[PDB]
Amino acid sequence: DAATTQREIEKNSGAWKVILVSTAAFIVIGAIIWFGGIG
Amino acid sequence: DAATTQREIEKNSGAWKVILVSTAAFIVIGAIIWFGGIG
Amino acid sequence: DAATTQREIEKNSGAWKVILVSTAAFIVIGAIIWFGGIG
Amino acid sequence: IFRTEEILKAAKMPPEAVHMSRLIDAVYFPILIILLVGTYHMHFMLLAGDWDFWMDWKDRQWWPVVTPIVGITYCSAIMYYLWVNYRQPFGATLCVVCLLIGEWLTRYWGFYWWSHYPINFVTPGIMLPGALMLDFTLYLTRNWLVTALVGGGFFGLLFYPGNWPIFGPTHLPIVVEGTLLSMADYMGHLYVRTGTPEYVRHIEQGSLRTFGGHTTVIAAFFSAFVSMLMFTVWWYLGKVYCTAFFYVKGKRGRIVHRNDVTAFGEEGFPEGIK
Amino acid sequence: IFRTEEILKAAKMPPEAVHMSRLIDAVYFPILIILLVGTYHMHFMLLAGDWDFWMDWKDRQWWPVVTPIVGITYCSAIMYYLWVNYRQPFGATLCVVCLLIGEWLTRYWGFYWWSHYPINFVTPGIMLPGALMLDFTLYLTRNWLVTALVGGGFFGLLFYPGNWPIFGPTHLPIVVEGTLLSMADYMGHLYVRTGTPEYVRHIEQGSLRTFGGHTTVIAAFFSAFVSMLMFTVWWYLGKVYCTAFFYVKGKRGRIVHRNDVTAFGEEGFPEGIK
Amino acid sequence: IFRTEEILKAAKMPPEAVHMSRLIDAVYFPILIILLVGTYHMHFMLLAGDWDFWMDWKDRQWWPVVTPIVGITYCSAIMYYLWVNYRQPFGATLCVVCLLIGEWLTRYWGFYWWSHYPINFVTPGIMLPGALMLDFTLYLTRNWLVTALVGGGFFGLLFYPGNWPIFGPTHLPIVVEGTLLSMADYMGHLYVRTGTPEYVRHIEQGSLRTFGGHTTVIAAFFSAFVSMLMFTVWWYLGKVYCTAFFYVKGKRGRIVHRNDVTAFGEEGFPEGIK
Amino acid sequence: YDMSLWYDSKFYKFGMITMLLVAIFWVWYQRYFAYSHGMDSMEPEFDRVWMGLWRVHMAIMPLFALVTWGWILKTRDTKEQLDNLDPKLEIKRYFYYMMWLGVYIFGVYWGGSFFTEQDASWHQVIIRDTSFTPSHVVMFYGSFPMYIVCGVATYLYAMTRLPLFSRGISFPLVMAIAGPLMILPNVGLNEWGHAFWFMEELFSAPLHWGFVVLGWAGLFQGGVAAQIITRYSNLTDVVWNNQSKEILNNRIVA
Amino acid sequence: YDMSLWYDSKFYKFGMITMLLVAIFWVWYQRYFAYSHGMDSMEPEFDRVWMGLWRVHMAIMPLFALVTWGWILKTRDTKEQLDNLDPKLEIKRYFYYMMWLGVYIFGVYWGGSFFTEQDASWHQVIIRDTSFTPSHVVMFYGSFPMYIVCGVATYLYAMTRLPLFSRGISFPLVMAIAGPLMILPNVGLNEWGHAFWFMEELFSAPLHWGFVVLGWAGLFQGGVAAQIITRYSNLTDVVWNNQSKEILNNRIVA
Amino acid sequence: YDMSLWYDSKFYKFGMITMLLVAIFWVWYQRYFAYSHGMDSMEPEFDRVWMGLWRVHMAIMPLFALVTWGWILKTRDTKEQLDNLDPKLEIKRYFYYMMWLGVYIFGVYWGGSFFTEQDASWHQVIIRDTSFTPSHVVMFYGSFPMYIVCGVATYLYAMTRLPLFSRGISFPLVMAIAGPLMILPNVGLNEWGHAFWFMEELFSAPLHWGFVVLGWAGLFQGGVAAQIITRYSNLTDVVWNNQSKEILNNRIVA
Ligand SMILES: [Cu+2]
Ligand SMILES: [Cu+2]
Ligand SMILES: [Cu+2]
C-alpha cells in the first residue's frame, strides 16, 4: 500500500534517533553518576 | 414418583436410628471396656 | 507355492551345516588358542 | 456496588437457582477453609514447623529461607484453582490465614494450656504481607509467569521485614553469668524443653566465607529465587490437582477416561435457554 | 472339572487351533519361568542378596524391611501382566518360586560345592507365604488398589513370622571365650569369609531411642507400609512393561506409533466367524 | 561437485528464493555458533571446568570420567537437532569447536592477560577426536541407537589417548626439596592460586582395592558406559528442545496448542506449485 | 419456593457437633490423664488408663466403620432408580455428598493439624517419643482412623446415591481420600525412623515428610469441586431453565 | 531483483558493534581498576570506583529496558495491519526478529561464557569471593541484565511485528529467553552457597549447577528455528511460487 | 492333522542343549582351574590358564556373532516373499521367533542369575575382587556376550522372517534385548566402583544397581508377548476360521 511504505519509513528514522539520543544520554547520565559520586 | 418419596422417607427415619443406637452402644461398649480393664 | 517349499527346504539343510561347521571350528580354533598360548 | 446483578443475569439464573448457588457457596467455602487449615498446617509444620515453634530458632540463615519456600507451595496451587476456575484472587491470603488460624489454635491449646509454655515464646509468627502482595500481583498483572517472577520475589523478600516488628525486640542483649545472649536465647534456656536440646537448632553459625552484615539480605534473595521456581512448579501441580475425570467401562470391559462437561459453556447453549 | 470346554467354545477354536494354543503355552511358559528366574534373581541378589546369603545377616531391623520391599517389585509387575492380559492369579507365587529355584541352584553349586560353605549357613530362606496371600487377595478382591493395601500389608507383615521357623533355632545363645554370641554369629565367625569382615554387616545395633521389645514389630509395619506404595508404583510400571507398539514409517519418512489389534476382540467379529 | 543443484531443483526455489535462503543461512548460522559458544561454555565450565583450568587437575580417575560425560550432553542434542531437521552430520564437532573457541578466548584474555598465569598452565585441552568419531558414526550408521552405543564408546574411550600428547610431557618427574613431584604438580605449586589450595583437587589418591596399572583403562570404560546412556537421554531431550508450538486462544478464552506446518511438506503441494 | 426439596442439613450438623464433642473429650482426657498416668510407660496405671483408651479406640473405630459402611451399602439405589433419578433429589444428594466431604475434612483437620502440634507440644515435655504416648492414643489410634472411616463413607455414599459416581470412578475423589488414608500406615515409617538412625529431635524431620506427600493428595479437592460444580450447573440448567435431560447422561457413557 | 524489500541489517550491525564496544570497555575498566582499587572491599577508593560502576549499571540498565521496551510497544502494529501484512515485509520482519535473537545471544555469550571464566580467573588471585568484586560488577550487574533486556525486546518485537507471534505464544522462544533471564536471580543461590556450608573453593561446585540447568533452556533454539524455517518456507511458497495465502493463516487459528 | 506345517523345534532343542553344555563346561573349568591357578593374578600359570580362556572367549564370541548374524541376514526374505507369506508358515516362523527368545532368555539366566551368585561365592573366598577372576572370565567375558549375540540374533530373525517385525519396530522387543545388552558395558561402572571410593565389601552395593535397572528392561516381555499373542490370534482367525486376510495387513500400515 502506501501507509506501509510510510509507516515504515517513519519508524526507520524514528528508531535511528531513539538510538542516538539514548547513546548520548546514557553515557552522560552514567558519567554524571561516575564523576559525581552519587551514593 | 411415590416410591421415591417413600423409599427416602424410610431412609430418613432409618438413618436417624442407626445413629442413635450406635451413639448409645458405642459409649456403653467402650465404658464396659474402660471400667472393666479388658486386656 | 513351490519356491516356499524349496527356499525353506534349502535353509533347513543350509542352517544345519552352518551349525556343524561352526561347532567343529569354534572348538578347534579355541584349542589352537588354548594349547598354543597365543598372547 | 460491584456488578453482581450483571454477573447473575449473564449466568441466566432464576431466583431459586440463585438461592441454590448461595447455599452451595455457604456449604462449600467453610469446607475448603477447614481443608486448607488441616492440610496446609500439616505440611507447614512437618516441613518448617521447628523454626515456627520457638523464638530462638528464628535466625538469619535458615528461618527466612525455609519458611517462604515451604509457604509458597500451597498458595500457588490454591491460587491456580481459584483464579483458573472462578477468577478469584484471594488464594494465597486464604492459605496463610488458614495456616495462622490453625497455628494459633494449637499454640493456645497445645503448647500453652497443656504444655505450660508461655504464649510469647511460641509466636509463629506471620507470613501474610507476602501472600497479600502475591495476590495483588496476580490480580493486577493477570499473567501467571510475571506473577511467578514478581510475586515470588515479593514473597521471598518481605518475609523478614514483615516479621521484624514481632521478633526484633526479642534480639535485645542480656548478660547471664558473664555470657552474652540474645533475649530469645535466654527465653529458650529458661523454659526447659526436655525433647529439644540446644544443639538441634538449625540456625546461623558464621563462616570464614561469610559477610555478617549481608547475611539476611542474601537469605532474602535466595529464598526469593527458589520461590520464583517453586510457584511455577506448583502452578503446574495445580493443573494436576484440578484433574477431574471418571474411569467408565463398557463391553470387552475396557476402561476409558471420561470428562463431564458444563452444558452452559457450549457454543450455542446460552442462546437456546430462552 | 473347572470350565475349560466352555472357555474353548467361547473362544471359537477348532481342534487344530486348540492344539496350536497348547503348543504355544508349552513353549512360552517355560521361557517366562526362566526369564523370571534370571532377572528376578539378579534384581534380588543385587538389591537384597547380602542379607540373603548369610545366617548372621538376618536381623530385626534391615533384613525384614529390605527383603519384602525388594521382593514386591517383580511380583506386582508380573501379577499385573498375568491378571490384566489373561486373568491368571499366580503371579507373585510364580515370581517367588522362580527366585527360590535360582537361589537354591546357586547355593548348592556356587556356595557349597565350589566355595565349601555349609548348606545350612546359606539358607535364603523363603518369602512365599506373603506372595501366596497377595495372590489370594488379588483374586478374591478383584480390585488392584484394595489388593495394593491389604496384600502389601500381608507381604510386609508375614515375612518375619514365616521365616522364624527356619532361623529361630539359629538364635540360641552360645558362650565362646567368655563372650555371649548367637549361634548364627558363631557360625559366621567359624566359617571364614575372606571378603566379608564383621563390620560390613548392616544389622541392628540398638539406640537410646529404641524399644528393644518392639523392634521387629516396627520393622514389620514399616516394611508393610512401603510395600503398599511399591506395589502400586510397580503396578503402573506393569502398564509400561506391556507397551507393545511398532515404529512404522511412510512417504516423507515420518515415524508413527502403530498398534496391532486382536481381530477377535472387535465388536462383531465373533458373530461373523460362523 | 556435491549435488547442490539437484537439491535446489527438488526444493523448487526461484533464484531470488535461493538468495533469500543463502541470506537466512548466513544470518542464522553465526547466531547458532555464538549461542553454542556461550551456553556450552557455561555448562562445561560449571560442571567440569575445574579439571579444565589447571594442569595438575588432569588425573587418571576424575578428569577422563567427568569430562566426556559433561561434553556429550550438548553434542547429542545439537546432533539431534541438525540431523533430524536438516540432515547435517556436524553437530558434535561444531559443539566442541565452539567450546574450544570460547575456552581459548577466556584463557588468553582472562587467565593470562589479566590474572598473569602462563598459557601452558591453562591448556584445556581438546575433546575433538571423540566428537569427530561420533559424527562419523552417526553419518555412516544412520541409526541413532547404534550411534549411541558405538559413538558413546568412542567418545568415552578416545578422550585420554587424544589428550596424552598434550599433557603427557607434563608428567615428567622432578625432585624438589628431596620430594618427588610431577612437573604439573610443581607448576601448580609454583604459580600461586590464592583461591585454590592443594586439598581441593578432586584427583586420584590410590586405594587398597585399586589396580594402579589399570586405573585409566577403567576410567576409560566407565566414562564410555555412562556416555552411551547420556547420549540417549539427551537425544530425547533434543525432541524436547525442538518442541515448537503456540498457545492460541478463542471464545470462552480457552488455550490450545497449535503447530505451524510446512506447506511444502504436504501430500500434493509440490505438484501444484507448477 | 420449596427449600426442602433440594436441601437438607440435619445429618451434616449432627456429624459436625459429634466430631467436635469427640475432639473435646479427647482434649479433656489428655489434660486429665497425661501428667499423672502418662509419664511412665511401664507403670500399671499407664496401662489401665492409656492402653485402656487405646483398646477402646481399637474396639470402637472398627465398629464405627462397620456400621457406617454397612448402612450406606445396605440402603443402596438400584441401577433403575439411579437412571430415573429426580434432578431435585440429585441436587439434594449432591448437597449430602458435599456434607460427607465436609465431615471427612473436619476429621482430617482434627487428625493432621490440631492433634499434631499438640503432639510436638508433648514431644518437648517428655524425654523421648514412645509409641502409645497420651498424644498418639487420641490421634494415631483415634483421629487417624476416624477421618479414614468418614472418607470411605463419603465416597461410598457418592458412588451409591450419585449416579455419576456409580457410573465412572471420580479420579480426584479417590486421591483426596486415599491420601489421609495412606497417612495412617505412615505411622510405621514414623516409628521406624524414631527408633533407628533417622533421628528424633526435630519435628520437621525427613521421616515426617511422608505425611506431607500423602496429604498433598488432599489438594485434589480442585477436581472434586470441578465435578461437583459441573454437575450442579447441569442440574440447574435441567431443572430451572427447562433444558433437555440429555446433558446429564451424555458425557459419562462408554 | 530488489534486495531491500525483504532484507535490512543496519540495526543488527549497530547492536553488534555497540555490544562489542561495551564489552571492550568493561574489559578495560577491569584491567585498569581491579588490582589498584578492587583488592579491598572496605577501602573508600573501592567504593568510589567499583560501587560507582555498580550504581552506573543500576541506573543505566533499567533506563535501557525502559527505552527499548517502550519504543517497541509504542510503534506497534494494530490487528488490522497484522492481518493484511505484505509477505515481503513479513520476510523482512522475520529477518529483523532473527537479528534481535542474534543480539540477545551475543549478550548471553558475553554474560555466561567470556565474563565467567574471567571470574574463575579472578577467584584464584583473590583470598575469597566477595559480592561486588570487579568481575561481578561487569557481569552480575552488567552483562546479566544486558542480555535479559535484549531477550525481552526480542520477544517483544516478534509478538508485536510478527502476526504469528502476536497470535499464538511461541513456546520455544519463551524458554529460550526465560532461561538466561532466570539465571540472574540464581545469583542469590550463588551468594547463599558461597557464604554458607555449600563451599566456595571449586568453580564447578554444585551451587554453580543452577546456571547450567537454567541455561539448558537456551537449547529451545531448535523449536524457535523450526518455527522460523516453517514460516520462511510458507512465505517463499506464497511470494515466489504464486501459491495461495491461506497457508499463512490456516494452522494457528483457534 | 499335520503338525509339521506350523511347528518345528529341532533348532530350539539344539540351542538349549548346546547352551547347557557350554555352561557345564564353564562350571567344570572353574572348579578345576580356580584354586590352583586362579588365586594369584601375577603368576604365569594364571596367565596361561585364565587369560588363555579369556582370549579364547574374545576370539570365539565375535566369531559366534559374525556367523549367526551373517547367516540370518544372508538368507533373508524379500518384501515380495514377506507380503504373500503363507499364514501357516507365519505361525511356524512365530514359533521360531519364540524359540529364539527362549534361547536368549536362557543366556540371560546363565549370565545374570547362576554365574552371579557363583561370583558372590568367589568374592568371599578371595581377598579382594580382581578383573579377570575365574568367575569374571566365564560370565563377564563369556556368558554376558553370549546372551547379547542371541538377543541380536532373536530380533534379527524376527525383523527378517516376520513381516510385522520387518514392517514396524517392536518397541518392547527393543528394550527386552537392549537391557541385558547394556548390562555388559556396566562392567565399566562395576570396576570403577570397586577400584575407587564406591566400596567393594557388599555385593548388594549401589554400584551393583546398574545391573538391576538395566535388567528391568527384561520385563518388556509383556509387550513382546502381547504382540505375539495378538498375531497368533489373527493367524488362528485367518487359517482355521476362514476369515479375511485383511486383518493381518490393516493395523501396521503408515
Ligand atoms: Cu509423636
Ligand atoms: Cu564469582
Ligand atoms: Cu565380581
Curated annotation (Swiss-Prot), chains D, E, F:
Compartment(s) of residence: Cell membrane; Cytoplasm
Binding site for Cu(+): 185, 189, 202
Function statement: Part of the ammonia monooxygenase complex, which catalyzes the oxidation of ammonia to hydroxylamine, the first reaction in the process of ammonia oxidation to nitrite.
Keyword match Oxidoreductase: yes
InterPro entries linked to this entry: NH3/CH4_mOase_suA_sf, NH3_CH4_mOase_A
Cofactor(s) for this UniProt protein: Cu(+)
Cofactor: binding comment: Binds 1 copper ion per subunit.
Protein name: Ammonia monooxygenase alpha subunit
Phenotype of gene-disrupted mutants: Cells lacking amoA1 grow more slowly than wild-type cells, while cells lacking amoA2 grow at rates similar to wild-type.
Transmembrane intervals: 27-47, 64-84, 94-114, 121-141, 148-168, 217-237
Activity regulation (record text): In vitro, inhibited by acetylene. In fact, acetylene is oxidized to ketene which binds irreversibly to His-189 of ammonia monooxygenase alpha subunit (AmoA).
Keywords associated with the record: Cell membrane, Copper, Cytoplasm, Membrane, Metal-binding, Monooxygenase, Oxidoreductase, Transmembrane, Transmembrane helix
Domain of life per record: Bacteria
Enzyme nomenclature, EC number: 1.14.99.39
Enzyme kind, highest EC tier: oxidoreductase
Membrane association type: Multi-pass membrane protein
Xref: Pfam families: AMO (PF02461)
Molecular function via GO: ammonia monooxygenase activity; metal ion binding; monooxygenase activity
Catalytic activity: AH2 + NH4(+) + O2 = hydroxylamine + A + H2O + H(+)
Keyword Transmembrane helix listed: yes
Entry GO terms, CC: cytoplasm; plasma membrane
Miscellaneous note of the record: The physiological significance of the two gene copies is still unknown.
